[PDB]
Amino acid sequence: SPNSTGTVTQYNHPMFVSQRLTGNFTSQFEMNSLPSHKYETLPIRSGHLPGYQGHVPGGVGAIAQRKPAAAMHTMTHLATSGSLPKGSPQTDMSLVDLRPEQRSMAKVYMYAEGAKTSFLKFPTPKTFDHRN
């Protein structure tokens, strides 16, 4: 059940990020109840403890998150990857930090790595040619 932000723009968010949206990416807050499971402001039943010394599948996923939130976000990233294309991108708005700039998700803030391109697409020997 991905979160649905009310903001609309000319373009639609890429499918590799639309399926993965947390409750914190909302345009309007819930002033009555800030401490809630929606905003992950309470202790989490899931997620490993800060002193946990085992192996977490995230490892390098989250860039600005604490251990339990990072664990939840990487677990959700790996959980719903089946519906995504096989060559899906690795990063996500959940794993990446939530800036106050980009909380409303007004614009297309993360699009490049999932865009089809040939930026570093060097010629393979079977596809090689000498610019004849």
Binding site: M31, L34, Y39, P50, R99, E101, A106
Partner: protein, 436 residues
């Protein structure tokens, strides 16, 4: 009672974004600029008056100006979350960067924008009636936050004079840095910030990186996490103007009880408890415990060990379920400790402050709902070593006159470099003489 904030540079604006995100949540103001029709969370219709100004019916704009030379950060706010919140003519923006050049942003680029900034802040102050002062945010590493950040300070000083001007600078770390020419900018900023600011609060990036990594168990932090808890300190030290307290403290009392001499105004901020949600509700925290936790060098947000120096005057801000009895009992225990000592000529020492409203939480942030928190603000001679190291690594470069030709190309000359170097040296001599 109103106080207006000025945010300068990339660092200042990024900090002020979290600051205003926290402020709007404190008073229940949605990003659209108005409280919802229902859910009147707060009490008192004049609480927002010190930060927000009520306009017409059902709209409150903040009292702030976001000014910078690059529009690559200012324009991000214009189309970000708070498009509706900020008044459009408060997000000032330029055309060219200072490019980490204090001379550039102090003599070439800041000249044509300081007048506009002063024009806007003038009519911002006119709407106000009980102006307590100003509180500015900047980093002393870059050029925009240093050159015009000091030019604006000088212009406000000459224009207003007696108004207090709080300063929250982000000083370069001793070794973990992101720029090269920053010692020059830091020295040149300290030279003019000495005579214009009234209370300047040092802040070090890596000193907060350590706090996030250890206390918040954030093995990978970033700038946003730092700006999140900077806003917490600002809110903690400004909440006495907003909310009622058992023993309140206004802006003018900080200057009176924390500045023994006109030039020694450089405070060491600290905060407690910095704890995640997982460990917050498992370990009970009392007033006597959090005040102890706010005095270790491992909780200082500036990397100077207080053991190397002597305290002149300490300031303590308390929020939440705090009573005078336990706080003034815990203060006595601190004075009996031998690892920290005050100067000879200050038998009084601390200045406590109690407020009832606990700090609020940031959804998606890093802190948790804490029953009671402390924002320690100190004044010690341990900061004397910071200027010594900055002076040493400034002189290590000035001997060869490296990177100087950029500064002299914008209007400044070597006389400014000298006269700032001797100003820093004189401040050092002041610190050892007073600590004698």
């Amino acid at each position: 009672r109103e106080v207006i904030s000025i945010h300068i540079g990339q660092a200042g604006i990024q900090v002020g974004n979290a600051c205003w995100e926290l402020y709007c949540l404190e008073h229940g103001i949605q990003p659209d600029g108005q409280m919802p029709s229902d859910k009147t969370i707060g009490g008192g219709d004049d609480a927002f008056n010190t930060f927000f100004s009520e306009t017409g019916a059902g709209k409150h704009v903040p009292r702030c100006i976001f000014l910078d030379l690059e529009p690559t950060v200012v324009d991000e706010v214009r189309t970000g979350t708070y498009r509706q919140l900020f008044h459009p003519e408060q997000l000032i923006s330029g055309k060219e960067d200072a490019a980490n050049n204090f001379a550039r942003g102090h003599y070439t680029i800041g000249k044509e924008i300081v007048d506009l900034a002063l024009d806007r802040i003038r009519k911002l102050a006119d709407n106000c009636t009980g102006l307590q002062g100003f509180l500015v945010f900047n980093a002393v590493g870059g050029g925009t936050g240093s050159g015009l950040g000091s030019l604006l300070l000088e212009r406000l000083s000459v224009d207003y004079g007696k108004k207090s001007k709080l300063g929250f600078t982000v000083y370069p770390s001793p070794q973990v840095s992101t720029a090269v020419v920053e010692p020059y900018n830091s020295v040149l900023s300290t030279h003019s910030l000495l005579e214009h600011t009234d209370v300047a609060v040092m802040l070090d990036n890596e000193a907060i990186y350590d706090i996030c990594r250890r206390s918040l168990d954030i093995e990978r932090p970033t700038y946003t996490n730092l700006n999140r808890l900077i806003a917490q300190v600002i809110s903690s030290l400004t909440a006495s103007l907003r909310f009622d307290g058992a023993l309140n403290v206004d802006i003018t009392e900080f200057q009176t009880n924390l500045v023994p001499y006109p030039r020694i105004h450089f405070m060491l901020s600290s905060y407690a408890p910095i704890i995640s949600a997982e460990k917050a509700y498992h370990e009970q925290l009392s007033v006597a415990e959090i005040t102890n936790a706010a005095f270790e060098p491992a909780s200082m947000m500036v990397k100077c060990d207080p053991r190397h120096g002597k305290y002149m005057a300490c300031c303590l801000m308390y929020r939440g379920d705090v009573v005078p009895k336990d706080v003034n009992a815990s203060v006595a225990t601190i004075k009996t400790k031998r690892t920290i000592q005050f100067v000879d000529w200050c038998p009084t020492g601390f200045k406590c402050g109690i407020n009832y409203q606990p700090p609020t939480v940031v959804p998606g942030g890093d802190l948790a709902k804490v029953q009671r928190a402390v924002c320690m603000i100190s004044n010690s001679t341990a900061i004397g070593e910071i200027f010594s190291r900055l002076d040493h690594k400034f002189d290590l470069m000035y001997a060869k006159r490296a990177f100087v030709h950029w500064y002299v190309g914008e209007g400044m000359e070597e006389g400014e470099f000298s006269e700032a170097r001797e100003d820093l040296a004189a401040l050092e001599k002041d610190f050892e003489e007073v600590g004698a």
